[PDB]
Amino acid sequence: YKTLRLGDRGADVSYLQRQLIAAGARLDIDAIYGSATRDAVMAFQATHGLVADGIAGPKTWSTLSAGRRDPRHLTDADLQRAADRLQVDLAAVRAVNEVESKGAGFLPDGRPVILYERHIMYRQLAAAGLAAKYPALVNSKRGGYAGDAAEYARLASASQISGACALEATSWGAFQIMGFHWKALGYPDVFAFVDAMKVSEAEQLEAFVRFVLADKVMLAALRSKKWAKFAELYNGKAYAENLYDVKLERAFDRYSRAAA
């Protein structure tokens, strides 16, 4: 089923509303995904170990249609743990998770979502002591991305140049944490970092938590709900073009309201 959210209308919404009612909700079946429908999705998610974001996406649909929950998927309780780790208001963590996560931390084939960065590979190889031989894989210029499972082909090729460097030059999981942070974030080595990324979305969120903890300016921005500053630090100079700042701000308002 297609992902549904606040403001959606139509046959897919009435189908959702019926499924929510079958799972115990009380709703008017009017094909309008308004606040009552959103609240019901949230209540359903919370009670079935999903992330309670009020968005009926593929994870919610899977539980709602088949009663299945993948144990690799992030839960509400993981977000509460992250809020405790960060000393950040839970609503702020929920907002960050909604806006900044890729959502699914794993590809359909079960491996973590990755993006291999040939310009970082270039950098890690130089620091360890090729760009002409393998220009798509090693390059001072950014890019060459394939995406999705095809990234693993690029990673596999890079790994044959240097296994540690290639993992360091790749971003991992739902928050796309660069492997080269493994040391800064207190992991034993890059292989252990990657192994953790393969276990669960909870581990992928833990990487994000550590990443934020390692940058006190970023941490402070998050704690103080300085969304534009957090987005600039986290997403980079082009944060505004994708509305990260305002999406965070408006998500946080939603979650602050919901918790009240």
Numbering used by the authors: 2 to 130, 136 to 266
Can you quote the paper on this entry?
The overall structure comprises of two clearly distinguished domains, a smaller N-terminal CBD domain (Lys3 – Ser66), and a larger EAD domain (Asp77 – Ala264) located towards the C-terminus. CBD domain is composed of a bundle of three antiparallel helices (α1-α3) and is joined with EAD via a hinge region spanning amino acids (Ala67 – Thr76). The EAD domain is organized into two sub-domains: first encompassing helices α4-α5 (Asp77 – Glu101) and helices α10 to α15 (Gly185 – Ala266), and the second containing β1 (Ile115 – Tyr117), β2-β3 (Thr176 – Met184) sheet intervened by helices α6 to α9 (Arg119 – Ala175). The structure of the EAD domain of AP3gp15 is characterized by a deep concave cleft at the subdomain interface. Despite a relatively low homology of amino acid sequence (31% and 39% identity, respectively), a high structural homology of the entire AP3gp15 N-terminal part to the domains of clearly identified function strongly suggests its role in PG interaction. The large enzymatic C-terminal domain of AP3 endolysin shows structural homology to proteins of lysozyme family. The comparison to HEWL, the closest structural homologue among lysozymes, allowed to define the core structure of AP3 endolysin, where the entire fold of HEWL is encompassed within α5, α10, α12, α14 and α15. This core is decorated with large protrusions (α6-α9) characteristic only for AP3 phage endolysin and not present in classical lysozymes. The crystal structure analysis suggests that only a single catalytic residue (Glu101) is present at the active site of AP3 endolysin. Experimental data of AP3gp15 mutant Glu101Ala with a decline in activity by 99.4%, confirmed of Glu101 involvement in the catalytic reaction.
